[PDB]
């Protein structure tokens, strides 16, 4: 879980 | 009718025009178009040419003798530079292209992403998803489209960026933020029924902290179709609490109804 949204492969 | 003839201002192999048939909004200019990743703080990428694994091929690198193909598991490109049908579009392998240490020529079969954009794309205004990118030509399955290009930042820096609409995780993990510096890929929307996939690729360096993100078509794409990939749950776990998916697929995983249903 991170603070910001991340796109990913 | 055309607003900008090329939002890339000649930086790509082909132009990328911009149109807006929806409203009077000008094509976006609140970012800097760059064609290769940039740094706004020291990244310390390992660029040592002697650290490259490389092949000793005397041919076009289509044989079992190619180390680079083996690093990739196999060379996944066919004679036309498209991914083999056998390519795993669900869980893509790491691709190691040939590089400046290889004995092969620059036109060997294992250098697709490093040769850049070849297909005709258009930046356009969508109905419900802001700006998006669509095809101006037929794009066969397995074709390289474009790279996700932006500002290289640390995981920690990424977690404190105010705008998290353009963050792409590369994996001490790093991230590409295309908010302030980016290419055409920054405008590619999310689709729950996607027609492109991102793939991690190594070219002129093999620093594993810094894969480059290459988009390939995962099926045939027809002229006029919007390009989109599955942004993934590390995007939607957060974003679904602020807005809902407008892709309109009957398979949509992040729609208002899908989100309400899961919350209930
Ligand atoms: C990488 S940007 C894509 C380009 C963006 N549409 C623009 O105009 O700059 C991602 C943002 O586009 C919007 N977006 C992309 N896909 C969407 C979708 N399927 N449904 C709703 N909004 C979407 C969201 O604001 C998301 O944070
Ligand atoms: Zn080779
Ligand atoms: Zn090689
Ligand atoms: Zn080669
Ligand atoms: Zn959807």
* Helix/strand/pairing category of chain B: mainly beta
Instruction: State the largest interface.
Output: A-B, 9 and 27 residues
Tell me the β content of chain B: 15-25%
- CA radius of gyration of chain B is 19 Å
The distinct ligands, each listed once, are: S-adenosylmethionine, zinc ion
PDB class: transferase
Keywords: histone methyltransferase, SET domain, transferase
Assembly: dimeric
Entry title: Structure of G9a SET-domain with H3K9M mutant peptide and SAM
Write the layout of secondary structure elements.
The complex is a heterodimer of chains A (9) and B (264).
Chain A: no helix or strand
Chain B: E1 18-19, E2 32-33, E3 38-39, H1 67-71, E4 95-96, E5 121-125, E6 131-135, E7 144-148, E8 150-154, H2 155-158, E9 167-169, E10 174-182, E11 189-190, E12 196-202, E13 212-217, E14 228-229, H3 233-239, H4 256-263
Parallel strand pairs in B: 1-5, 2-10, 3-8, 4-12, 11-14
Antiparallel strand pairs in B: 5-6, 7-13, 8-10, 9-10, 12-13
Bound molecules: S-adenosylmethionine and zinc ion (4 copies).
PDB class: transferase
Keywords: histone methyltransferase, SET domain, transferase
Assembly: dimeric
Description:
Chain B: Residues 241-257 form the Post-SET domain. Chain B: Belongs to the class V-like SAM-binding methyltransferase superfamily. Histone-lysine methyltransferase family. Suvar3-9 subfamily. The complex is a heterodimer of chains A (9) and B (264). Chain A has no helices and no strands. Chain A is mostly loops and 9 residues long. Chain A is elongated, with a radius of gyration of 7 Å. Chain B has 264 residues and is mainly beta. Chain B has a single domain (1-264), classed as Beta Complex (Beta-clip-like), CATH 2.170.270.10. In chain B, the strands form four sheets. In chain B, strands 2, 3, 8, 9 and 10 form a five-stranded mixed β-sheet that branches. In chain B, 39% of the residues are buried. The A-B interface holds A 1-9 and B 92, 148, 155, 158-161, 164-165, 167-169, 175, 197-200, 213, 229, 231-232, 234-239. The complex binds S-adenosylmethionine (SAM) and zinc ion (4 copies).
